Design an enzyme around this catalytic site. Sequence first.
Site, PDB file in Angstrom:
ATOM      1  CG  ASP A  84      -1.920   1.045   1.394  1.00  0.00           C
ATOM      2  OD1 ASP A  84      -1.854   1.804  -0.236  1.00  0.00           O
ATOM      3  OD2 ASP A  84      -2.892   1.023   1.720  1.00  0.00           O
ATOM      4  CB  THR A  85       2.142   3.723  -2.827  1.00  0.00           C
ATOM      5  OG1 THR A  85       0.979   3.570  -3.572  1.00  0.00           O
ATOM      6  CG2 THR A  85       2.963   2.469  -3.263  1.00  0.00           C
ATOM      7  N   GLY A  86      -0.381   4.214   0.131  1.00  0.00           N
ATOM      8  CA  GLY A  86      -0.873   5.159   0.386  1.00  0.00           C
ATOM      9  C   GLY A  86      -0.647   5.022   1.800  1.00  0.00           C
TER      10      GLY A  86
END
Lengths: 99, 99
Positions: free
Chosen positions: A25-27
């Site tokens: 999850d880059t968020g």
Amino acid sequence: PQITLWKRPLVTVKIEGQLKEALLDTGADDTIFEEMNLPGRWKPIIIGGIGGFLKVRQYDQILIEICGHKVIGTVVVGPTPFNVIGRNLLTQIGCTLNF
Amino acid sequence: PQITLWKRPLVTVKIEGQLKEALLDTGADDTIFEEMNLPGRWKPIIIGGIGGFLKVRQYDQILIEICGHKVIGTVVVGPTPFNVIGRNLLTQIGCTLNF
Ligand SMILES: CC(C)CN(C[C@@H](O)[C@H](Cc1ccccc1)NC(=O)O[C@H]1CO[C@H]2OCC[C@H]21)S(=O)(=O)c1ccc(N)cc1
């Protein structure tokens, strides 16, 4: 490995001898996992997301083996629909976005 | 462009003639933006994130220009701490994770 995004980017990880799937999850600034026991003194904290805020337990320097790599960093434990590998551990494996 | 994850992967996008920064979120199945008006008919829906669920308005076939590329797809409007580019639009630009 190169990972496309047509399906959820789930990977198998090994954390504290337990096998789990986690979302790359880059968020997510931080890594969070569903309920489980971990080593060390944990401080109760609260994280905020789309649909509200969540009280959780913070553990420091936790070992996760992810798809053959090893990383140590902060891991948060609490109720999440997915185990999430935040950027605090993605950088350690040199993960990047490309297009 | 290659993007590391030491800092939040924010990009400048142009949507409905408005300039916004959005988060390249591999953990987000769909794209969501803070309040704004958009063309077409919207159906009220509810999304689920870490910490609860959120009621929102769904719009289809929305054009976003992202860092020089163009994409059309479902965009959801609602109260989010960040504008998020979910996988529904990341695939269209051929975005991938690498390590
Ligand atoms: C909870 C995940 C399974 C999915 N989420 C995407 C995720 O990247 C969010 C996206 C995100 C980003 C910022 C704020 C809220 C949500 N990041 C996140 O929750 O990170 C939290 C843990 O580390 C911290 O970093 C910031 C928030 C904390 S989500 O925001 O709830 C989401 C779910 C479904 C859709 N269609 C769109 C978004």
